[PDB]
């Protein structure tokens, strides 16, 4: 659809949807967060035209990275929780978010960036990888428009945002294997 | 008994007796180690004349600190295992052992120091705290003799060893609450 519809639709969905006791507490944070990401995805123009398999494959591949972006905003200035093994994670999450906040993304930019991250996940296992890619390009097209309407003289603004993607792949490849804990 | 008997007896006992897969592996290291400490204690002249309650009370109070001393030798030069939450522990254990190794204790000195650590544990709960104290003094008496026969010009050698005790109390007070994990 039109660049304006996509921006509007995504931004709206983003606005609406978003001792060892510490480890248990962190551990159960993820369940509602993952469900928030799943609901957001459903509001992304074209996501629910992908096959069930491809939808599910993208969320599995891309949800951790989206959570890295969401934590980013939910961080701080001050900021510990090292002793649970979430040390190098939440400390990696802090440094990433610092970087992200330097861009000073508006809520529309952040919402649309977040959507770009989800559909920019690794595509190993796609039934129709081409459909996933058309969706990615649609979203990146909108993001580029948005960013250039917003800041015409910063022409590498979109470039900087796109550079967050390798970073997210790295955080993903290093920390998605961190252990959670749930009292049986 | 005589200073020579104590040194001999303790030194001998010391010589004779001494992903998440990493966390499980570390976790089960402690069980034989704790049993080694319990057997050592039984060879300490006068330990088994303390009441069962006092014996048990000392091992509970003092075994973690003894393990800190044992790890000390079983460390290295190079040296990771941060991600399990044993980060600030094994890293505290590294710095303590560095300090300990600078003294360059002989095996007799280390053996007798180790015994001093066990019986120098916090005495909250002692049926006969005076008996525990006479034992402590006996062992410190021997250690002082030993250290001064060995290095007569370093007169603060025994002083430096005694300064490891507050350190051990601190490591104890900070890290004894670290979580272990055992597959049920």
């Amino acid at each position: 659809p039109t660049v304006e519809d996509v921006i509007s639709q995504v931004a709206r969905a983003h606005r609406e949807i978003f001792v060892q006791e510490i480890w248990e507490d962190f551990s159960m944070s993820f369940t509602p967060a993952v469900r928030e990401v799943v609901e957001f995805a459903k509001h992304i123009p074209g996501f629910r035209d992908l096959s069930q398999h491809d939808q599910v494959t993208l969320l599995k591949a891309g949800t951790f990275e989206v959570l890295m972006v969401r934590f980013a905003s939910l961080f701080n200035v001050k900021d510990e929780l090292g002793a649970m093994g979430m040390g190098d994670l939440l400390s990696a999450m802090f440094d990433f978010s610092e970087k992200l906040n330097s861009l000073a993304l508006t809520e529309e930019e952040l919402g649309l960036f977040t959507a770009v991250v989800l559909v920019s996940a690794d595509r190993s296992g796609m039934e129709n990888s081409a459909s996933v890619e058309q969706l990615q390009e649609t979203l990146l097209r909108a993001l580029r428009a948005l960013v250039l309407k917003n800041r015409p003289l910063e022409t590498s603004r979109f470039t900087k945002l796109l550079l967050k993607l390798p970073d997210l792949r790295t955080l993903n490849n290093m920390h998605s294997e961190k252990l959670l804990s749930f009292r049986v | 008994p005589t200073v020579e008997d104590v040194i001999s007896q303790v030194a001998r006992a010391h010589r004779e007796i001494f992903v998440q897969e990493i966390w499980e592996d570390f976790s089960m290291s402690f069980t034989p180690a704790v049993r080694e400490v319990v057997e050592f204690a039984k060879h300490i002249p006068g330990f088994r004349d303390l009441s069962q309650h006092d014996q048990v009370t000392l091992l509970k109070a003092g075994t973690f600190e003894v393990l800190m001393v044992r790890f000390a030798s079983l460390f290295n030069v190079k040296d990771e295992l941060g991600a399990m939450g044993m980060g600030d522990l094994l890293s505290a254990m590294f710095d303590f052992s560095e300090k300990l190794n600078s003294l360059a204790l002989t095996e007799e000195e280390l053996g007798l120091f180790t015994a001093v650590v066990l019986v120098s544990a916090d005495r909250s709960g002692m049926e006969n705290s005076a008996s525990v104290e006479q034992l402590q003094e006996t062992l410190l008496r021997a250690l002082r003799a030993l250290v001064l026969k060995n290095r007569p010009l370093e007169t603060s050698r025994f002083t430096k060893l005694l300064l490891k005790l507050p350190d051990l109390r601190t490591l104890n007070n900070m890290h004894s609450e670290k979580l272990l994990s055992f597959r049920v």
Binding site: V34, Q52, V56, S176, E177, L180, S181, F182, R183 | -
Partner: peptide
């Protein structure tokens, strides 16, 4: 007792459970 589960495996479980509801 506790269930120890990787952050990645928890994510797939929740996605799977969410799509089966």
């Amino acid at each position: 007792t506790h269930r120890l589960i990787t952050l990645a495996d928890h994510i797939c479980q929740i996605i799977t459970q969410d799509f089966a509801r």
